Amino acid sequence: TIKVGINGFGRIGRIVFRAAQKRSDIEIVAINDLLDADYMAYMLKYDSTHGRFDGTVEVKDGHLIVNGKKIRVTAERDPANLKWDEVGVDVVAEATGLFLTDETARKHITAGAKKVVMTGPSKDNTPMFVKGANFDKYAGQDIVSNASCTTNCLAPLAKVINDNFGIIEGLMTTVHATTATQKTVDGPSHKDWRGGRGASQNIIPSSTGAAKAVGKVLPELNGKLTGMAFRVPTPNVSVVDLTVRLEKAATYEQIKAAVKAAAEGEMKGVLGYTEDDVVSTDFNGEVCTSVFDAKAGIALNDNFVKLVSWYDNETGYSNKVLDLIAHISK
Amino acid sequence: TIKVGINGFGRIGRIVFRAAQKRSDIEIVAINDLLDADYMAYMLKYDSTHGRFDGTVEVKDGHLIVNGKKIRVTAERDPANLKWDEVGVDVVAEATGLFLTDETARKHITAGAKKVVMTGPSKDNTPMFVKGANFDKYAGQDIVSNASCTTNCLAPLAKVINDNFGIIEGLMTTVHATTATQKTVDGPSHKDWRGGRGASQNIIPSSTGAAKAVGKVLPELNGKLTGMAFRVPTPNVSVVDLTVRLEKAATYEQIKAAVKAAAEGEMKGVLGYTEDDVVSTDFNGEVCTSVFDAKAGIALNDNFVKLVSWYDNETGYSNKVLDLIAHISK
Amino acid sequence: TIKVGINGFGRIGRIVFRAAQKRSDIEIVAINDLLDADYMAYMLKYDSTHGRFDGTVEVKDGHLIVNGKKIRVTAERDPANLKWDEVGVDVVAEATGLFLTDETARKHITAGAKKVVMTGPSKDNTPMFVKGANFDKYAGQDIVSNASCTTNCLAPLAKVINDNFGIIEGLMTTVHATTATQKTVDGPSHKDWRGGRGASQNIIPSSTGAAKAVGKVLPELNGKLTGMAFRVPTPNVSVVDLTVRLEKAATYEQIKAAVKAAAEGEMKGVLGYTEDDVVSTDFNGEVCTSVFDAKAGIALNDNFVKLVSWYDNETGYSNKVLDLIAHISK
Amino acid sequence: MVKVGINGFGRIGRLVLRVCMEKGVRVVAVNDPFIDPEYMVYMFKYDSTHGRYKGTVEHKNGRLVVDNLEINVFQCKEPKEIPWSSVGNPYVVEATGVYLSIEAASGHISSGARRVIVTAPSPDAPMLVMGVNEKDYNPGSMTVVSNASCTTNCLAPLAKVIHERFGIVEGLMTTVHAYTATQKTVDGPSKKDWRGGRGAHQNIIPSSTGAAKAVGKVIPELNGKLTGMAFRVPTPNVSVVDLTCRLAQPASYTAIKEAVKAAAKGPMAGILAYTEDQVVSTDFNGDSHSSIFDAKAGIALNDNFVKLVSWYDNEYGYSHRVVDLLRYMFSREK
Numbered sequence A, B, C: 001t002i003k004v005g006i007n008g009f010g011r012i013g014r015i016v017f018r019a020a021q022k023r024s025d026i027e028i029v030a031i032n033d034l035l036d037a038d039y040m041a042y043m044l045k046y047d048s049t050h051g052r053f054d055g056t057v058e059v060k061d062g063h064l065i066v067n068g069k070k071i072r073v074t075a076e077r078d079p080a081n082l083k084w085d086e087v088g089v090d091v092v093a094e095a096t097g098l099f100l101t102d103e104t105a106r107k108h109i110t111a112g113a114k115k116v117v118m119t120g121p122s123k124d125n126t127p128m129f130v131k132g133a134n135f136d137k138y139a140g141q142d143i144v145s146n147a148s149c150t151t152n153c154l155a156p157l158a159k160v161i162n163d164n165f166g167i168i169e170g171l172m173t174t175v176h177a178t179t180a181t182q183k184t185v186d187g188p189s190h191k192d193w194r195g196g197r198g199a200s201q202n203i204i205p206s207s208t209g210a211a212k213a214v215g216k217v218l219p220e221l222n223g224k225l226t227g228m229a230f231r232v233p234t235p236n237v238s239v240v241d242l243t244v245r246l247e248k249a250a251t252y253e254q255i256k257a258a259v260k261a262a263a264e265g266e267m268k269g270v271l272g273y274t275e276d277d278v279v280s281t282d283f284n285g286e287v288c289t290s291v292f293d294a295k296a297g298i299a300l301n302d303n304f305v306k307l308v309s310w311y312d313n314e315t316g317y318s319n320k321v322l323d324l325i326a327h328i329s330k
Numbered sequence D: 001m002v003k004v005g006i007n008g009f010g011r012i013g014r015l016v017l018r019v020c021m022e023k024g025v026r027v028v029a030v031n032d033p034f035i036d037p038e039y040m041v042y043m044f045k046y047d048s049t050h051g052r053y054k055g056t057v058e059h060k061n062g063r064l065v066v067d068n069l070e071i072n073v074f075q076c077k078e079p080k081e082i083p084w085s086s087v088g089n090p091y092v093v094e095a096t097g098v099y100l101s102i103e104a105a106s107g108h109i110s111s112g113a114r115r116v117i118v119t120a121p122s123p124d125a126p127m128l129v130m131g132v133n134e135k136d137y138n139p140g141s142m143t144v145v146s147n148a149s150c151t152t153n154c155l156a157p158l159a160k161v162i163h164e165r166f167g168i169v170e171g172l173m174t175t176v177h178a179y180t181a182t183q184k185t186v187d188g189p190s191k192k193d194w195r196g197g198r199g200a201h202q203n204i205i206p207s208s209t210g211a212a213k214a215v216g217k218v219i220p221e222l223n224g225k226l227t228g229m230a231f232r233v234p235t236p237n238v239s240v241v242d243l244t245c246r247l248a249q250p251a252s253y254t255a256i257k258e259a260v261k262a263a264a265k266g267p268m269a270g271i272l273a274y275t276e277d278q279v280v281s282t283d284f285n286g287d288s289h290s291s292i293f294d295a296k297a298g299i300a301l302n303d304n305f306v307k308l309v310s311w312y313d314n315e316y317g318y319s320h321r322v323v324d325l326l327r328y329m330f331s332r333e334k
Ligand SMILES: NC(=O)c1ccc[n+]([C@@H]2O[C@H](COP(=O)([O-])OP(=O)(O)OC[C@H]3O[C@@H](n4cnc5c(N)ncnc54)[C@H](O)[C@@H]3O)[C@@H](O)[C@H]2O)c1
Pocket: A007, A008, A009, A010, A011, A012, A013, A032, A033, A034, A076, A077, A078, A095, A096, A097, A098, A119, A120, A148, A149, A179, A180, A181, A313, A314, A317, B187, B188
């Protein structure tokens, strides 16, 4: 059983935690945030997006008790002081958003852990892995990244589309839910001025390297995709709107057939396929990181098409983080 | 004119600033915040709740220029290092939320200003003034507080009802817009666990001092009112719900008569009165700090009644902050 | 086993349906609305608030197949034409909002049903029943009402407080989630002008009979309670805020103990109790019609207190409709 | 001295009356069988999105009285029964969404109207987007016209500038669109659009448009070269078009930016606007333009494959254009 330690118990850390409960191959043996253990329990117990926690949580001697299982709680601002080895943590899930470089993340290995998974795209050359795209390329690196939730939606779709028909070029938009970084009313964000504007009131243009990043986990698609985002007032679930030019002409039904073949075979559990009249809330809790929406899409012609695919940016991503942890331990 | 300086260009600072431009007695000469001059210009020009700035804004050189007038831009964390005198500031509007004691607020006085108005309830013995309640008890103090937006709503109504019918006792609920202190999705709020929960997603119970603080600005009501808040997913405008036991019997028609008489008389422009079928967005931009809703309220009998009054937590309070500045410098 | 027909497959109709799947005493045999069978399947399968249907659903020969049981689907505008006898229906859940008098509800009996439960307050002297208050005063009548969601929250709480301390008088506010009668953007609501205004933009005052209606189910409280609502931008879960004058002095601990013992005792399943830092999404899917919030409430003194109780206006009420159905069929 | 009658006092019809008050265009009558004079006053005086009406609104003797200007209120179900003749034969703004065919909107002509503007796409009435093809209006042959959709008025002025300058070989549009009156507050019935009945405030809802095809009608060279779709999202107003296109002639994003600025400053002033500021949707709440280009929000893959972004207040910009078009129609009377 792979022991894991979550650093940062925010949205991802918490939903990764809930997702690990249903796995046999992984134990979450420790958590580090900047919160008292009782507050950490409260945040685990109750969730505005995902309902109440299925199971028991208790606090004794400053340690969480979750379904009879002790979890070490710490509050070390500096990942250097974490003593990961006094709990036997094999891998740490880096979920604070702060340590997305080798140098910063490597402190976990210095503090006792063996390997690290960053729960965001790396800010340096830390290699990125996306299930159904390039998990098999992993070479034993002790520090990795699961890229972003959007790359986790886009890449599996793009692989199938490229593998069957050939993407000459593609431009992507993600209509994306509100995230922690945003502001409830017009506030400061000197990094990102639009991003400070009240999240409940606005459609907010936003930039992303999610489409570029696909060409890293799929090198054959390098230089061929790029894109952007609009943040909208939903608390969870997002959607990719990919417009691609194809080398081989394909009817919309041919494209449907291809994705459905992959979703049922090669990409099962990663890429999903629907023909129902679905909306965002229908995918709250979706574990598949990309779910093709057959009826949403549209073809101008056999060689030019807008494709649509859904993802629960919280749940799907958190699940593949555990899949990445699992894979690098194999 | 009275030269004002703003500390903290947040929601109140910005609305105070906009309201300042319509006044002939008051001129804002400097703002201090953790913001670039270009970013302050952006935040002033565009507003999700209150629309575009009515006036001209430029950064020349520069150098914030608004309506032709130069505004000094500083980025001092420590108020003691502001040199307010170097631009000739008499009153400082302290609107960061962080300096609500005489100790801290007095750093502006040593930085060269003459007086200070806190734009929030004082966390020490610092005196609080609410217009239509106790502005005339100002006895030349150099540091004062303007109370809270909610106290500015309830006190005016409370006094009219006390003066005419006598409050034996009251319990109050404010159904309240979301604010900058809340979170877009479930996030850390260690001093207020409910307040960390998704702002857009939830009705959030919240504790408020504003009903007890009515006792401070109306001593005749000390220990006679307490209450609480429900934060709800609206970006501006709140409402007070005052359940009162009355000494003297009173028909709703007599309550109305009194509220309207006070609105047209001694509390003109502070206390308002409506019989229309109004909802919250109808008081977006409301200058009156308390607007009585005749049709919303209800009486069980002539001694037990529920009274409803609206307020634009942002706009009305910002206007009364400016009134407090005018008054203390008479 | 009791055979039920649902008239009106809206929010209550569809949630009553789901809840009936989790019971063995009651089986839904027939459904009427002005909708095709395949559209009904869709509305059952997917719910924005309560997630995907737990189980199977399909259409076959113009009828539903839900968890392998054939449901009759009809599309009659007139209840008299419904032929409930052809499916052998015992009780009709009348949830269109249109047939809330004996006169109109009785068309279901004309159509072959034994009894009818109205899923709303009856608009004549048709008797009303709220579980925890007066189920046991059911005297064999063939048409009844389960009252409103708000009464079902208030009645149990009121009864517990009155029985222990004596409510001299009380005023109530409900901060209520948006419902189907509201409008997305400002539109016509010629019966309730405020209720035509954009639901998601506004705090909207509303009238309610819920507190007077408590006087009908608990005659001892007749003339002693009234109130009103504020509709707010949340899609589900509502809250009662009861301000009560107590005959007998009671500490907030004593009030807590009273509710907790009723919760675990004679009102188990109806009245709930909590001391956690809860918000509204924490009760999404709650079966109890009233969950006392201990920390949220506040007393001025031992004889004047504000009490708060949560309720899922959809789920809780729907469960109790099935409870009322099962009771009147005993 | 155009005189306008408004049929249907909804979002478009109320806001059309507002823009008419703002421009001194005389609205002589409003017909709505479901809103009476008293209730029109309330719906016009208070607006959740665009705020209180700045001015006075009263009712007197069964008339709507806005800024002392009396407006007749009718209560007829059918266009052919409305007394347009009794109020001086105005041009009618057909804003119900129910009489969309030439045959349907012509009822107003039977009952005394001089012209009709349908405030939506028509299956047969000529579309006329100001800035693009309003000169196609033939007063001699057209008594019923369509002012297209809100989305079409955003896409077309942009699409014109880009086609003329660089050539659009092909394009796919998405509009991320505010919710409207047709949607529901919580999941409810929408027989003809299952997704559109799901709660507007909780959901991103994929939705249909013919706005990009419609551009091929008003700019005939773009016929068959544009299509698209929509996502309805939890905002009360203001929408945005996301146009992904292949250009015939290579163009840097700076060349593109300069072409749009040009049009905005000259031939499409008041219709097409250009911004480089860090704007968001509320920044165009109350904006009069049909299309506001967002220079910094867009992205180019290369000189021939770009994604362009333009904003539009789907209510207030579109109302402004209805009033623009009927003033234009009136100027052309022989
Ligand atoms: N939110 C999503 O849907 C999503 C999806 C995929 C990836 N991600 C990525 O995952 C990361 C975290 O995302 P999130 O949404 O959970 O953000 P979040 O704000 O919810 O989580 C950050 C958490 O880390 C804690 N923290 C801050 N500094 C710390 C430190 N010094 N030591 C320990 N804990 C600290 C905070 O208390 C907070 O709870 C980010 O890199 C984000 O981009 C987010």
